[PDB]
């Protein structure tokens, strides 16, 4: 069976099926709160979302981009699983005669402002809590609720979006689904069920499932050079183990043993016993022949063994019987044609005598002359791919496309001489009476070459014959069909593949056996008496395989974007730092599957550039959330990353208190974020190379006390850098306040002097509030001196505002939808899995 | 007002042969068409696909079929008269194939 | 509700849907019911129900009146839900029919 | 030094069945003291042309 | 296309598959040899084209 690593990796692949995304909960997440100061009309309204983004992560820097990539990754994960919840069972209560939400529910949290209101405040605050209300709306004929909350942005398009993916699965998908699955179910000989749908609640409970189930066959089938790991992921998952058995032996003692003085080389090679080697070989045989031209068999000669002609010739003869290799398709290189004709002129040569004249062609080519009274030309047994003659598909149909097949890339129904694939078979009695054309023919011939008792052996054993290729064409026809099968222009090509001599197509592996080895196949026949129990499982290998597989394109589509829109710090990078930042930022499963194929064979970049412009992506929620995630995530200043800083000096209002109550009843904050960009007249660009001239003729520091003196701004550098958020009561220490955006050492050695420069790389923002007392005199924080701020940061989002009593509900603006308390919600993504498989009836 | 359905898990083992007999008895015990419904879609489906295999699974000497078009079951001409099985697949509508 | 089925259509009514084996197809097959006496409780079948149908009478009746105070009286019922009177009515009430 | 992937003479398609490489008579070798230095002979050659 | 001409197929698998390890080890020694040996010592190009 398989090897346990593929058995390991394929667990953990239904293991990492079954987790869980998104969430149920009663209030969604709070984004908005208070800062109530000595202000009692006027509070500060911060969304928290802003400062909880500001605190994640690590300092960027140009020296190490792969980390870059590894934040942003990270910071574009958190946002995707922030919002990943469904809200149900929302409280309320009711007044007026209609039903009004909590002010929890709302999603803003102010509890902390109203004991410092007014009679008027509360009257309007009561006023506008009537206001809200609850719609009794519907969606696919279910009825549901509609209210008014407050949520950010970001949030609120990914929430929209999980909306629209479950509107979608309760719409249309999961009908689609249960049809393609029980066409499935038809066609392949196993049994599901829908039990789980069919409860007396069944009329008002609303569905969910992760995985879409129609699988497109490109998707899979894109990856490049992975046609190997396709087979043998194939043959892991769906290929069944049954037993060998012979046939009566009194068959092959009465035909090659009739005569009892005289014998054969069959009667030595009737009664000869094998061993594990040849039936390791019949294993590959029988392998080869459950695949055609993907398989194809060779032949070994070891160095310790010998041949004997009565082992070859009968090779030969059989070997022409138990293989399809010409026509449409092929079996077996042109070297196994050559040695099975070889073998067949020593047969037919052997026992040559007076009462059968034979005519020898003139040609120098084995194999020419007629023989027999009707002296047929036996010309025709020439084995070539394109009349496909010496073979068991000669002059038969093998191809066809009948009906409209379930995996809409493989139409295929394979059928060997003539049977069909969808009688079942009674192998006890099948098979007296049916025939084609070759076999027919090489009794002919075997009976013009005077051999009786090899055509009693063929006809006695004819059931036999073609009662096993029955059993492979079952084995074939009903399990073997999966995504992971020949796609049909990718099969049409392989008999060109291999009599062109090129390999521009996937190379098909090939495989080695012994001569004797195909006698001892001959002479059994293979049972599927157990059938592999992975089957149930494979549509869900399929749809999370395609899932991750998307997952992975998008984010090469989007990250290949990076160096364009930032060049000055991804200078030196390369599209293998953010390869392996995907690479660290992924679940091994996939690693492991694409190692079974890239371990034989190299790829390089540009493979991945023109895997990823190929539009093949499957329908799944994750895909839908991370890719409105990544559209929600384009401005790079949400990514709490700006170069918008200065290094300007200013003072902080020192204020004078004429009226300690009226300036108690405003709100008074200091910030030093700055509404607008300055003029490109007062601010110069610094980078580097300057900061080292200036230093080296050695009028740093004077020039950077004159230029502000001159009150200017200054932008060192356009290396991005990190965001930090304060808040405050009291003063800030020295150290954010009077620092330096910058650094610059000097020092001697050995004569010399030395001298190096560096730019600050992480920045914060932070806020100030005044809090004052009664009993102060109003130029109590009057100063002889005012302090020197050096900070400057500017940001076109409005993070924090002074806000008025009427103003905070103003932010009622988001359309929520819910699901009734008395609903109930399920899920039966992991109920693809169940099923049972129906054993043919045998003998 | 009832309606029944096909129970599968994989803790009990049977001969094959009673899906065989079981699509048999089941066109001839329930009935599914005319004014009102017995059975649902998908075990309908199942027991016309058990009905077509015992028509397709055999044990003397082979009588010819000819198969019909599509790959729904039951579309094929069988045997010296060549009566047409695609008479007995079930539909709701007309209700073709049961005791009603 | 066979239109209703065959349609997808939204029904009041949702057919019990229930679970069989395949065998048992088979072995029913091969049984008769013969009911050999009648039920006891028959010759007391009717007057029962209309016991039923009289409570369900009396409290239909009262329901309505209370839907007419929260048309009458706004004030006194701020916070009225259906519910209440509901669950009010169904208090004071006989424990049968509840339990039916 | 750095030896190739093992894979890349063969690959595994079951428990029991796998291909085998055409050279699998050299491959299980391994060299003596003077055979590393022969080695050693033919990179420096290499890393010199001429 | 001389071995796939004389009939070895096998041998030619092997060879096609290690080709690019081959290419790799040489791009690597034209690394070391165009950037690590710049010295004097270095033959120049009379003595190299004579």
């Known amino acids: 069976f398989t090897v346990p690593d593929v058995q390991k990796i394929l667990d953990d692949i239904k293991a990492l099926a079954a987790e869980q995304v998104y969430k149920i909960v009663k209030v969604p997440s709070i984004s908005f709160r208070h800062i109530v100061m000595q202000s009692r009309d006027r509070v500060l309204r911060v969304d928290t979302y802003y400062e909880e983004m500001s605190q994640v992560g690590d300092v960027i820097t140009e020296d190490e981009p792969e980390k870059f990539y590894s934040t942003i990754i990270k910071k574009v994960r958190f946002i995707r699983g922030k919002g990943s919840f469904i809200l149900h069972d929302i409280p309320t209560r009711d007044h007026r005669g209609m039903e009004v939400a909590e002010p929890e529910v709302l999603g803003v949290e102010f509890k902390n402002v109203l004991p410092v209101l007014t009679a008027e405040h509360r009257a309007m605050i009561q006023n506008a809590l009537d206001g809200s209300i609850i719609e009794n709306g519907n969606v696919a004929t279910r009825d549901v609720d509609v209210f008014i909350g407050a949520c950010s942005e970001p949030v609120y398009r990914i929430y929209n979006r999980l909306q629209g993916y479950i509107e979608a699965v309760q719409l249309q998908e999961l009908r689609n689904s249960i049809g393609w699955l029980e066409r499935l179910g038809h066609r392949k000989r196993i049994t599901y069920s829908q039990e789980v749908l069919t409860d007396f609640r069944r009329q008002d409970t609303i569905w969910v ?57 069959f009667a030595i090679l009737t009664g000869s016993t094998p061993t594990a080697q040849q039936l390791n070989d019949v294993r590959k045989i029988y392998l080869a022949l459950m695949f055609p031209g993907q398989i194809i068999l060779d032949l070994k000669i070891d160095p310790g063994e010998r041949m004997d002609p009565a082992v070859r010739m009968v090779a030969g003869v059989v070997g022409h019987l138990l293989f399809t290799a010409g026509g449409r398709f092929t079996n077996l290189t042109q070297n196994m044609a050559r040695q099975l004709d070889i073998a067949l002129n020593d047969y037919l040569l052997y026992m040559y005598n007076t009462r059968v004249q034979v005519n020898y062609g003139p040609t120098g080519e084995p194999l020419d002359f007629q023989i027999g009274r009707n002296q047929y030309d036996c010309n025709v047994f020439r084995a070539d791919f394109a009349t496909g003659t010496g073979y068991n598909g000669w002059a038969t ?132 008496t157990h059938r592999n129990e992975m089957l149930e499982v494979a549509p869900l290998i399929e749809s999370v395989y395609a899932s991750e597989l998307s997952v992975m394109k998008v984010d090469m589509r989007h990250l290949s974007l990076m160096q364009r829109r930032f060049p000055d710090v991804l200078i030196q990078a390369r599209p293998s730092h953010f390869w392996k930042a995907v690479l660290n930022d992924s679940p091994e499963a996939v690693k492991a599957v694409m190692n079974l194929s890239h371990s034989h064979n190299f790829i390089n970049i540009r493979d991945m550039m023109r895997w990823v412009m190929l539009p093949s992506l499957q329908p799944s929620l994750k895909l839908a959330l991370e890719e409105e995630a990544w559209a929600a995530a384009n401005d790079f200043e949400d990514l709490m990353l700006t170069d918008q800083v200065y290094m300007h000096r200013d003072m902080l209002p020192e204020p004078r208190l004429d009226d300690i109550e009226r300036f108690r009843q405003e709100g008074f904050y200091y910030t030093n974020m700055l509404e607008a960009p300055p003029e490109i007249d007062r601010v110069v660009q610094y980078t580097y190379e300057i900061a080292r001239l200036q230093a080296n003729m050695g009028q740093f520091r004077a020039a950077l006390r004159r230029i502000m003196d001159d009150d200017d701004w200054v932008r060192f550098g356009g290396v991005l850098r990190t965001v930090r958020v304060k808040f405050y009561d009291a003063r800030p220490p020295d150290d954010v306040l009077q620092g330096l955006p910058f650094s610059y050492d000097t020092n001697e050695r050995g004569g010399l002097a030395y001298a190096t420069i560096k730019y600050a790389t992480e920045t914060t923002i932070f806020y100030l509030i005044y809090n004052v007392e009664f009993s102060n005199t109003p130029d109590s924080l009057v100063l002889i001196n005012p302090t020197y701020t050096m900070t400057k940061v500017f940001i076109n989002k409005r993070i924090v505002e002074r806000v008025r009593v009427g103003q905070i509900l103003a932010v009622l603006n988001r359309r929520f939808v819910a699901y009734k308390g008395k609903m109930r919600i399920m899920d039966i993504t992991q109920s693809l899995k169940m099923g049972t498989k129906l054993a043919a009836p045998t003998v």
């Open 397 to 528: 149909i093998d191809v066809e496309y009948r009906e409209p097949a379930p995996y809409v890339h493989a139409q295929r129904y394979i059928r060997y001489c003539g049977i069909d694939s969808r009688e079942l078979i009674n192998p006890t009695t099948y098979g007296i009476g049916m025939t084609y054309h070759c076999y027919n023919e090489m009794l002919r011939m075997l009976v013009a070459a005077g051999k009786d008792s090899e055509a009693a052996y063929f006809r006695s054993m004819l059931p036999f014959h073609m009662v096993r290729f029955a059993r492979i064409n079952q084995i074939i026809n009903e399990d073997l069909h999966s995504v992971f099968s020949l796609p049909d222009d990718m099969f049409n090509a392989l008999l060109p593949d291999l009599i062109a001599g090129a390999h521009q197509n996937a190379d098909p592996v090939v495989l080695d056996v012994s001569w004797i080895s195909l006698w001892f196949a001959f002479n059994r026949s293979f049972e599927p």
């Open 209 to 265: 499932l992760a995985l879409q189930l129609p699988v497109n066959p490109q998707v899979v089938w894109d990856v490049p050079r992975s046609s190997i790991a396709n087979l043998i992921m194939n043959i892991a998952t769906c290929l069944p183990t049954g037993e060998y058995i012979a046939p009566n032996p009194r068959i092959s003692s009465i035909t090659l043993t009739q005569r009892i003085t005289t014998t054969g080389p």
